[PDB]
Design an enzyme around this catalytic site. Structure first.
Site, PDB file in Angstrom:
ATOM      1  N   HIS A 129       0.816  -1.209   0.000  1.00  0.00           N
ATOM      2  CA  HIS A 129       0.000   0.000   0.000  1.00  0.00           C
ATOM      3  C   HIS A 129       0.855   1.266   0.000  1.00  0.00           C
TER       4      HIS A 129
ATOM      5  N   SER B 223      -0.697  -0.928  -6.314  1.00  0.00           N
ATOM      6  CA  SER B 223      -0.495  -2.056  -7.218  1.00  0.00           C
ATOM      7  C   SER B 223       0.187  -1.652  -8.520  1.00  0.00           C
TER       8      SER B 223
ATOM      9  N   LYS C 228     -14.509  -8.172  -8.889  1.00  0.00           N
ATOM     10  CA  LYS C 228     -13.618  -8.942  -9.751  1.00  0.00           C
ATOM     11  C   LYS C 228     -12.977 -10.107  -9.002  1.00  0.00           C
ATOM     12  N   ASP C 229     -12.595  -9.865  -7.752  1.00  0.00           N
ATOM     13  CA  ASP C 229     -11.973 -10.890  -6.921  1.00  0.00           C
ATOM     14  C   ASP C 229     -12.944 -12.023  -6.603  1.00  0.00           C
TER      15      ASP C 229
ATOM     16  N   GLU D 130       4.331 -34.432  -2.170  1.00  0.00           N
ATOM     17  CA  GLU D 130       3.165 -33.922  -2.877  1.00  0.00           C
ATOM     18  C   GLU D 130       3.645 -33.109  -4.076  1.00  0.00           C
TER      19      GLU D 130
HETATM   20  C1  HEM Z   1       0.144 -16.391   1.907  1.00  0.00           C
HETATM   21  C2  HEM Z   1       0.866 -15.798   0.947  1.00  0.00           C
HETATM   22  C3  HEM Z   1       0.507 -14.458   0.248  1.00  0.00           C
HETATM   23  C4  HEM Z   1      -0.557 -13.644   0.418  1.00  0.00           C
HETATM   24  C5  HEM Z   1      -1.755 -13.817   1.382  1.00  0.00           C
HETATM   25  C6  HEM Z   1      -0.412 -12.515  -0.486  1.00  0.00           C
HETATM   26  C7  HEM Z   1      -1.282 -11.450  -0.628  1.00  0.00           C
HETATM   27  C8  HEM Z   1      -1.192 -10.458  -1.588  1.00  0.00           C
HETATM   28  C9  HEM Z   1      -2.248  -9.557  -2.013  1.00  0.00           C
HETATM   29  C10 HEM Z   1      -3.693  -9.525  -1.467  1.00  0.00           C
HETATM   30  C11 HEM Z   1      -1.757  -8.754  -2.962  1.00  0.00           C
HETATM   31  C12 HEM Z   1      -2.544  -7.642  -3.693  1.00  0.00           C
HETATM   32  C13 HEM Z   1      -3.324  -8.253  -4.854  1.00  0.00           C
HETATM   33  C14 HEM Z   1      -2.374  -8.745  -5.912  1.00  0.00           C
HETATM   34  O1  HEM Z   1      -1.480  -7.962  -6.327  1.00  0.00           O
HETATM   35  O2  HEM Z   1      -2.503  -9.922  -6.336  1.00  0.00           O
HETATM   36  C15 HEM Z   1      -0.367  -9.108  -3.179  1.00  0.00           C
HETATM   37  C16 HEM Z   1       0.505  -8.523  -4.073  1.00  0.00           C
HETATM   38  C17 HEM Z   1       1.838  -8.845  -4.234  1.00  0.00           C
HETATM   39  N1  HEM Z   1       2.479  -9.934  -3.671  1.00  0.00           N
HETATM   40 FE1  HEM Z   1       1.649 -11.299  -2.398  1.00  0.00          FE
HETATM   41  N2  HEM Z   1       0.763 -12.686  -1.190  1.00  0.00           N
HETATM   42  C18 HEM Z   1       1.353 -13.863  -0.770  1.00  0.00           C
HETATM   43  C19 HEM Z   1       2.546 -14.376  -1.244  1.00  0.00           C
HETATM   44  C20 HEM Z   1       3.474 -13.701  -2.014  1.00  0.00           C
HETATM   45  C21 HEM Z   1       4.698 -14.243  -2.576  1.00  0.00           C
HETATM   46  C22 HEM Z   1       5.143 -15.710  -2.379  1.00  0.00           C
HETATM   47  C23 HEM Z   1       5.317 -13.262  -3.267  1.00  0.00           C
HETATM   48  C24 HEM Z   1       6.656 -13.281  -4.057  1.00  0.00           C
HETATM   49  C25 HEM Z   1       7.510 -14.311  -4.112  1.00  0.00           C
HETATM   50  C26 HEM Z   1       4.498 -12.069  -3.149  1.00  0.00           C
HETATM   51  C27 HEM Z   1       4.762 -10.834  -3.706  1.00  0.00           C
HETATM   52  C28 HEM Z   1       3.803  -9.910  -4.064  1.00  0.00           C
HETATM   53  C29 HEM Z   1       3.990  -8.748  -4.909  1.00  0.00           C
HETATM   54  C30 HEM Z   1       5.318  -8.325  -5.574  1.00  0.00           C
HETATM   55  C31 HEM Z   1       2.819  -8.111  -5.008  1.00  0.00           C
HETATM   56  C32 HEM Z   1       2.548  -6.828  -5.817  1.00  0.00           C
HETATM   57  C33 HEM Z   1       1.924  -7.261  -7.137  1.00  0.00           C
HETATM   58  C34 HEM Z   1       1.641  -6.070  -8.010  1.00  0.00           C
HETATM   59  O3  HEM Z   1       0.971  -5.117  -7.536  1.00  0.00           O
HETATM   60  O4  HEM Z   1       2.098  -6.081  -9.182  1.00  0.00           O
HETATM   61  N3  HEM Z   1       3.389 -12.374  -2.386  1.00  0.00           N
HETATM   62  N4  HEM Z   1      -0.062 -10.152  -2.324  1.00  0.00           N
HETATM   63  C1  HEM Z   2      -1.667 -22.247   5.468  1.00  0.00           C
HETATM   64  C2  HEM Z   2      -2.254 -23.009   6.400  1.00  0.00           C
HETATM   65  C3  HEM Z   2      -2.249 -24.563   6.416  1.00  0.00           C
HETATM   66  C4  HEM Z   2      -1.719 -25.434   5.533  1.00  0.00           C
HETATM   67  C5  HEM Z   2      -0.953 -25.143   4.221  1.00  0.00           C
HETATM   68  C6  HEM Z   2      -1.986 -26.778   6.009  1.00  0.00           C
HETATM   69  C7  HEM Z   2      -1.606 -27.953   5.391  1.00  0.00           C
HETATM   70  C8  HEM Z   2      -1.899 -29.232   5.821  1.00  0.00           C
HETATM   71  C9  HEM Z   2      -1.608 -30.467   5.118  1.00  0.00           C
HETATM   72  C10 HEM Z   2      -0.908 -30.591   3.747  1.00  0.00           C
HETATM   73  C11 HEM Z   2      -2.046 -31.489   5.857  1.00  0.00           C
HETATM   74  C12 HEM Z   2      -1.926 -32.976   5.450  1.00  0.00           C
HETATM   75  C13 HEM Z   2      -3.289 -33.664   5.446  1.00  0.00           C
HETATM   76  C14 HEM Z   2      -3.259 -34.844   4.512  1.00  0.00           C
HETATM   77  O1  HEM Z   2      -2.660 -34.722   3.413  1.00  0.00           O
HETATM   78  O2  HEM Z   2      -3.826 -35.909   4.871  1.00  0.00           O
HETATM   79  C15 HEM Z   2      -2.641 -30.945   7.066  1.00  0.00           C
HETATM   80  C16 HEM Z   2      -3.214 -31.657   8.102  1.00  0.00           C
HETATM   81  C17 HEM Z   2      -3.710 -31.142   9.282  1.00  0.00           C
HETATM   82  N1  HEM Z   2      -3.742 -29.803   9.630  1.00  0.00           N
HETATM   83 FE1  HEM Z   2      -3.244 -28.240   8.395  1.00  0.00          FE
HETATM   84  N2  HEM Z   2      -2.683 -26.680   7.196  1.00  0.00           N
HETATM   85  C18 HEM Z   2      -2.863 -25.340   7.478  1.00  0.00           C
HETATM   86  C19 HEM Z   2      -3.518 -24.840   8.585  1.00  0.00           C
HETATM   87  C20 HEM Z   2      -3.886 -25.556   9.708  1.00  0.00           C
HETATM   88  C21 HEM Z   2      -4.296 -24.998  10.982  1.00  0.00           C
HETATM   89  C22 HEM Z   2      -4.374 -23.479  11.258  1.00  0.00           C
HETATM   90  C23 HEM Z   2      -4.573 -26.019  11.817  1.00  0.00           C
HETATM   91  C24 HEM Z   2      -5.052 -26.000  13.294  1.00  0.00           C
HETATM   92  C25 HEM Z   2      -5.275 -24.894  14.011  1.00  0.00           C
HETATM   93  C26 HEM Z   2      -4.346 -27.253  11.088  1.00  0.00           C
HETATM   94  C27 HEM Z   2      -4.518 -28.529  11.582  1.00  0.00           C
HETATM   95  C28 HEM Z   2      -4.310 -29.699  10.885  1.00  0.00           C
HETATM   96  C29 HEM Z   2      -4.642 -31.037  11.332  1.00  0.00           C
HETATM   97  C30 HEM Z   2      -5.298 -31.407  12.679  1.00  0.00           C
HETATM   98  C31 HEM Z   2      -4.286 -31.898  10.378  1.00  0.00           C
HETATM   99  C32 HEM Z   2      -4.461 -33.431  10.433  1.00  0.00           C
HETATM  100  C33 HEM Z   2      -5.666 -33.810   9.578  1.00  0.00           C
HETATM  101  C34 HEM Z   2      -5.195 -34.495   8.323  1.00  0.00           C
HETATM  102  O3  HEM Z   2      -4.066 -35.050   8.333  1.00  0.00           O
HETATM  103  O4  HEM Z   2      -5.944 -34.491   7.312  1.00  0.00           O
HETATM  104  N3  HEM Z   2      -3.932 -26.932   9.810  1.00  0.00           N
HETATM  105  N4  HEM Z   2      -2.529 -29.567   7.005  1.00  0.00           N
HETATM  106  C1  LIG Z   3       6.957 -34.767   5.859  1.00  0.00           C
HETATM  107  O1  LIG Z   3       7.221 -34.766   4.447  1.00  0.00           O
HETATM  108  C2  LIG Z   3       6.363 -34.092   3.680  1.00  0.00           C
HETATM  109  C3  LIG Z   3       6.381 -34.242   2.363  1.00  0.00           C
HETATM  110  C4  LIG Z   3       5.419 -33.484   1.534  1.00  0.00           C
HETATM  111  O2  LIG Z   3       5.352 -33.545   0.342  1.00  0.00           O
HETATM  112  O3  LIG Z   3       4.627 -32.709   2.294  1.00  0.00           O
HETATM  113  C5  LIG Z   3       3.502 -32.097   1.632  1.00  0.00           C
HETATM  114  C6  LIG Z   3       7.320 -35.145   1.649  1.00  0.00           C
HETATM  115  C7  LIG Z   3       6.922 -36.460   1.442  1.00  0.00           C
HETATM  116  C8  LIG Z   3       7.752 -37.339   0.785  1.00  0.00           C
HETATM  117  C9  LIG Z   3       8.983 -36.927   0.330  1.00  0.00           C
HETATM  118  C10 LIG Z   3       9.386 -35.634   0.532  1.00  0.00           C
HETATM  119  C11 LIG Z   3       8.559 -34.729   1.192  1.00  0.00           C
HETATM  120  C12 LIG Z   3       9.008 -33.319   1.407  1.00  0.00           C
HETATM  121  S1  LIG Z   3      10.006 -32.618   0.052  1.00  0.00           S
HETATM  122  C13 LIG Z   3      10.217 -31.010   0.674  1.00  0.00           C
HETATM  123  N1  LIG Z   3       9.748 -30.529   1.774  1.00  0.00           N
HETATM  124  C14 LIG Z   3      10.139 -29.191   1.921  1.00  0.00           C
HETATM  125  C15 LIG Z   3       9.798 -28.387   2.998  1.00  0.00           C
HETATM  126  C16 LIG Z   3      10.255 -27.082   3.013  1.00  0.00           C
HETATM  127  O4  LIG Z   3       9.982 -26.194   4.016  1.00  0.00           O
HETATM  128  C17 LIG Z   3      10.714 -24.982   4.110  1.00  0.00           C
HETATM  129  C18 LIG Z   3      11.036 -26.589   1.976  1.00  0.00           C
HETATM  130  C19 LIG Z   3      11.378 -27.378   0.909  1.00  0.00           C
HETATM  131  C20 LIG Z   3      10.925 -28.691   0.881  1.00  0.00           C
HETATM  132  S2  LIG Z   3      11.178 -29.925  -0.308  1.00  0.00           S
END
Ligand code: HEM
Ligand code: HEM
Ligand SMILES: CO/C=C(/C(=O)OC)c1ccccc1CSc1nc2cc(OC)ccc2s1
Ligand SMILES: CCCCCCCC/C=C\CCCCCCCC(=O)OC[C@H](COP(=O)(O)OCCN)OC(=O)CCCCCCC/C=C\CCCCCCCC
Ligand SMILES: CCCCCCCC/C=C\CCCCCCCC(=O)OC[C@H](COP(=O)(O)OCCN)OC(=O)CCCCCCC/C=C\CCCCCCCC
Ligand SMILES: CCCCCCCCO[C@@H]1O[C@H](CO)[C@@H](O)[C@H](O)[C@H]1O
Lengths: 61, 48, 101, 146, 44, 380
Positions: free
Chosen positions: F202, F206, F228-229, F272
């Site tokens: 901000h 953008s 739009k979103d 994955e």
């Molecule tokens: C949980 C992860 C993230 C959230 C919730 C998030 C959220 C947002 C939102 C709401 C915007 C404004 C709308 C848009 O421009 O699409 C934005 C813009 C932006 N984000 Fe993220 N973002 C995430 C991850 C990232 C990552 C991984 C990168 C870079 C590696 C990044 C870099 C940027 C940049 C450079 C902008 C400005 C885009 C532009 O105005 O041209 N963000 N982000």
């Molecule tokens: C960005 C946020 C999150 C991501 C990316 C994420 C991702 C994941 C993933 C990949 C699994 C594996 C499940 C499967 O493949 O079977 C998992 C499982 C689980 N997560 Fe999350 N998670 C998020 C947020 C949360 C939060 C906030 C909580 C609790 C406060 C939570 C609780 C759990 C639990 C209890 C499981 C076990 C259930 C299962 O294995 O299906 N997660 N999560």
């Molecule tokens: C507990 O392992 C989780 C795995 C996965 O894919 O999770 C979604 C998995 C399963 C089989 C073989 C390998 C993996 C993980 S490969 C990986 N896992 C990570 C995690 C990171 O966190 C910063 C960054 C880079 C990498 S690359």
């Protein structure tokens, strides 16, 4: 004119609009469900438990 | 393995119907609002 | 060897900012130097640049471009900001050199 | 006055033969436009929604004094006469105007305004440094719900 | 109840270039100065 | 004072200045939608995660069973597990397009915004990594085993660094309990950094597809991009609900249906899909320590993007050479994703080594070079 009247009677005032949404949703749910359940049950005729239920109860056991 | 098999697909039907309906409606509302900008014309008229 | 002119004219058309009715210096990213050079621009050139940009922006949101007739020709592109930008850079390089010695 | 919203603002009901233009016009500084437009559209909604008898009891008294002030001299009387025939087909005495005006109450002002203003797509003319005021859609949404 | 309003920018202060749309103004009297409760300020 | 109570109210003010009166470029495309998608997806994952956590038991003797009990006994628990698991994939899909957008439209020049972005990505990867261990299946345990056992390649400090993180001598109950605590915690960090991510944004507002000053044509966020979103939401949410309610077990390894057994190594330990590209780069270097570095470098390289910008124009819209080079990189990442899902044999080995080699080459060498070469064709 349905469009004209739907506007002035429902969509115009913000209060009447919101009430339409509620009233319309209540009716939509009652309709959409029964329709969806019907479309799904016909697509699986004789497959569900409700279909094969008569063989093991409510007539013989 | 998955007793929810029947209800899951029953939900998938309800989802797809609702999602199809809502996506269409929201597309109109977006296009409707953006119609102001999409049709807008502009001119450059200095006191040249 | 008219090769260099062949390549530049090709890239200019391949770039395609002329389709938006933009000059080459319109597409310049405004860093600290470009910003300063822009402020030195005469009123007429500045107000014209402003319209061309706003027009390109309006076109971009329409996902449309200008008719082929209204495309900026390669030979008709005015480098209106480049002379200004070069002096801005020359002046700065002087200060940076004068502040080391 | 309280928020320094504008240099001036005026309301007009320019009538023509088969149509007219009910609206308002204001002059403001580049950074007071949006707040001014905000309050102006708010009072429009206040007309259609909240108009009190106390308000129109004053407004009627002002309009009475206005139409009478309109006929101060020979030229402004001649102007009224030359226009009354040309537009109404007859002369409307101040006596008749008063009768029409004195019958106006708050319930009527709400109805008439709700008829011509509420949820209607307005016409907008903006000249000068006009960044703070933007988007027709925002202006359009200011046409409903006080 | 009548009279047209105005407003300019101060600090430095903030339709008179014809022969006719500038005419009608060339000081007949001297200079009157008006101000009102609800009517625009005037000058002659 | 201030007239309305939308510009005044210190709570409604930053609600107003972020989602209502916030000036946005008139011409940003659908590639700008994935920002708000990630935001909603984060709030979705947190909610579905909380609902799952209220039925989860962090213990090696009850983990697998508790998750199974959730799917079988908890009302719509099968769905909440379904949404949370597939929602994690929706997160990575949106974040890969979010990143790809910025790389293409030069959004990385918002360095503070960009850097907080990379950190958000790194936290997300760590979050999904520890969450995968929670159901404690075969791929859960051995995925955790293979990855964490890499840290022992670090000289001296390494072998201690691992056994500390494990809380023992192998992945076990002391590891599961701390991974659950970590998986519970991290998403709230993602939420917080997001607020910082948006704050830095901000500052400049953008960017736009053309890469030129959009001050000449700004529109209020509402209703143009508020609408739009939401459209972009339901547009993207349909394929994944279709994915989750028709082919729920499409993305995941079936090996995770076999309870964790430390005495049986799965034949092919793959991650994955969203880790596959990084997994392939990890296995490119046969050396264990070099592989770790190459893995870390594959993601940490995003920090070097802003310093490798040499083009006089911000975006790639008017840069045809950088365009195809960009799509080479995108295709490069696909080939890496493919290689990572395949066994370590010929020809997959040499293909992976080349694809991972080109990956760094394009980003480090060709992108700043081609950008320069373009500038001289623009006569600069
Ligand atoms: C949980 C992860 C993230 C959230 C919730 C998030 C959220 C947002 C939102 C709401 C915007 C404004 C709308 C848009 O421009 O699409 C934005 C813009 C932006 N984000 Fe993220 N973002 C995430 C991850 C990232 C990552 C991984 C990168 C870079 C590696 C990044 C870099 C940027 C940049 C450079 C902008 C400005 C885009 C532009 O105005 O041209 N963000 N982000
Ligand atoms: C960005 C946020 C999150 C991501 C990316 C994420 C991702 C994941 C993933 C990949 C699994 C594996 C499940 C499967 O493949 O079977 C998992 C499982 C689980 N997560 Fe999350 N998670 C998020 C947020 C949360 C939060 C906030 C909580 C609790 C406060 C939570 C609780 C759990 C639990 C209890 C499981 C076990 C259930 C299962 O294995 O299906 N997660 N999560
Ligand atoms: C507990 O392992 C989780 C795995 C996965 O894919 O999770 C979604 C998995 C399963 C089989 C073989 C390998 C993996 C993980 S490969 C990986 N896992 C990570 C995690 C990171 O966190 C910063 C960054 C880079 C990498 S690359
Ligand atoms: C690692 C992750 C592995 C998985 C990656 C999956 C990627 C699958 C493909 C992504 C979807 C591709 C969509 C097809 C779009 C094709 C197309 O038409 O592009 C051209 C058109 C160009 O537009 P302009 O020239 O600005 O328009 C001006 C006139 N209107 O589209 C674009 O804007 C380009 C958008 C680029 C998004 C690409 C997304 C790629 C996702 C991966 C990026 C990774 C970057 C590096 C991250 C390392 C970690
Ligand atoms: C490239 C590396 C490849 C390998 C990756 C492996 C990843 C898995 C490693 C597992 C190691 C297990 C160690 C367990 C010890 C846990 C000790 C601990 O307390 O954790 C610190 C823990 C988590 O750190 P990591 O997830 O390691 O960091 C990732 C990047 N942020 O602390 C935090 O991050 C912050 C927690 C507080 C959040 C408070 C709320 C958020 C506030 C943010 C600011 C908001 C401003 C508004
Ligand atoms: C935008 C996404 C909308 C998805 C709407 C899905 C509504 C699912 O609704 C569900 O359908 C099931 C099958 O009949 C019923 O058993 C459940 O009681 C009902 O809640």
């Amino acid at each position: 004119a349905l469009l004209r009247q739907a506007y002035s009677a429902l969509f115009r005032r913000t209060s009447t609009f919101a009430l339409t949404v509620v009233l319309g949703a209540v009716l939509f749910e009652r309709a959409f469900d029964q329709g969806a359940d019907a479309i799904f049950e016909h697509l699986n005729e004789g497959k569900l438990w409700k279909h094969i239920k008569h063989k093991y109860e409510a007539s013989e056991e | 393995a998955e007793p929810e098999h029947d209800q899951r697909k029953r939900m998938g039907l309800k989802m797809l119907l609702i999602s199809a309906l809502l996506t269409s409606l929201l597309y109109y509302m977006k296009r409707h609002k953006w119609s102001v900008l999409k049709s807008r014309k502009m001119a450059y008229r200095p006191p040249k | 060897g008219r090769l260099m002119d062949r390549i530049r004219k090709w890239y200019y058309n391949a770039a395609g900012f002329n389709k938006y009715g933009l000059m080459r210096d319109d597409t310049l990213y405004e860093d600290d130097d470009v910003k300063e050079a822009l402020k030195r621009l005469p009123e007429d050139l500045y107000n014209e640049r402003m319209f061309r940009i706003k027009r390109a922006l309006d076109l971009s949101l329409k996902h449309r471009i200008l008719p082929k007739e209204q495309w900026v020709k390669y030979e008709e592109d005015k480098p209106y900001l480049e002379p200004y930008l070069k002096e801005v850079i020359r002046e700065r390089l002087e200060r940076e050199a004068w502040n080391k010695k | 006055v309280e928020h320094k919203l504008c240099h001036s603002f005026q309301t007009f009901n320019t009538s023509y033969s088969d149509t007219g233009l009910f609206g308002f016009h204001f002059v403001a500084d580049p950074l007071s436009i949006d707040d001014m437009m905000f309050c102006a559209q708010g009072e429009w909604m206040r007309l259609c929604t909240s108009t009190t008898e106390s308000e129109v009891k004053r407004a009627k008294n002002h309009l009475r004094s206005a139409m009478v002030a309109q006929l101060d001299g020979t030229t402004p009387v001649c102007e009224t006469i030359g226009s009354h025939l040309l537009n109404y087909g007859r002369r409307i005495s101040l006596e008749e105007w008063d009768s029409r005006i004195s019958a106006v109450d708050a319930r009527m002002v709400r109805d008439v305004c709700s008829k011509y203003i509420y949820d209607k797509c307005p016409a907008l003319a903006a000249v000068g440094p006009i960044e703070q005021l933007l988007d027709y859609n925002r202006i359009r949404s200011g046409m409903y719900w006080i | 109840x009548x009279x047209x309003x105005x407003x300019x920018x101060x600090x430095x202060x903030x339709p008179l270039l014809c022969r006719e749309s500038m005419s009608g103004r060339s000081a007949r009297r001297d200079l009157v100065a008006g101000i009102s409760l609800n009517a625009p300020a005037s000058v002659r | 004072m201030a007239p309305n109570i939308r510009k005044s109210h210190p709570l409604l003010k930053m609600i107003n200045n972020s989602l209502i009166d916030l000036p946005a470029p008139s011409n940003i495309s659908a590639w700008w939608n994935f920002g708000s998608l990630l935001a909603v997806c984060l709030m979705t994952q947190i909610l579905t995660g909380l609902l799952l956590a209220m039925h989860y038991t962090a213990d090696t003797s009850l983990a697998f069973s508790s998750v199974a009990h959730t799917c079988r006994n908890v009302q719509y628990g099968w769905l909440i597990r379904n949404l949370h698991a597939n929602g994690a994939s929706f997160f990575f899909i949106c974040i890969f397009l979010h990143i790809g957008r910025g790389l293409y439209y030069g959004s990385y020049l918002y360095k503070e915004t960009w850097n907080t972005g990379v950190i958000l990505l790194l936290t997300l990867m760590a979050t999904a990594f520890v969450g995968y261990v929670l159901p404690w299946g075969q791929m859960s345990f051995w995925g955790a085993t293979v990855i964490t056992n890499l840290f022992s390649a670090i000289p001296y400090i390494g072998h201690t660094l691992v056994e500390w993180a494990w809380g023992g001598f192998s992945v076990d109950n002391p590891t599961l309990t701390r991974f659950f605590a970590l998986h519970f915690l991290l998403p709230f960090a993602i939420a917080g950094i997001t607020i910082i991510h948006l704050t830095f944004l901000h500052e400049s507002g953008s960017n736009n597809p053309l890469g030129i000053s959009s001050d000449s044509d700004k529109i209020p966020f509402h209703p143009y991009y508020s609408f739009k979103d939401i459209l972009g939401l339901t547009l993207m949410l349909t394929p994944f609900l279709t994915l989750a309610l028709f082919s729920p077990n499409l993305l995941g390894d079936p090996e995770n249906f076999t309870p964790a057994n430390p005495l049986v190594t799965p034949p092919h330990i793959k991650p994955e899909w969203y880790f596959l590209f990084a997994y392939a780069i990890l296995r490119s270097i046969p050396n264990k320590l070099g592989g770790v570095l190459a893995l870390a470098a594959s993601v940490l390289i995003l920090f070097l993007i802003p310093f490798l910008h040499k083009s006089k124009q911000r975006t790639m819209t008017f840069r045809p050479l950088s365009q195809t080079l960009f799509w080479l990189l995108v295709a490069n990442l696909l080939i890496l994703t493919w290689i990572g899902s395949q066994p370590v044999e010929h020809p997959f080995i040499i293909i992976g080594q080349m694809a991972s080699l080109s990956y760094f080459t394009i980003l480090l060498i060709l992108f700043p070079t081609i950008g320069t070469l373009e500038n001289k064709m623009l006569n600069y």
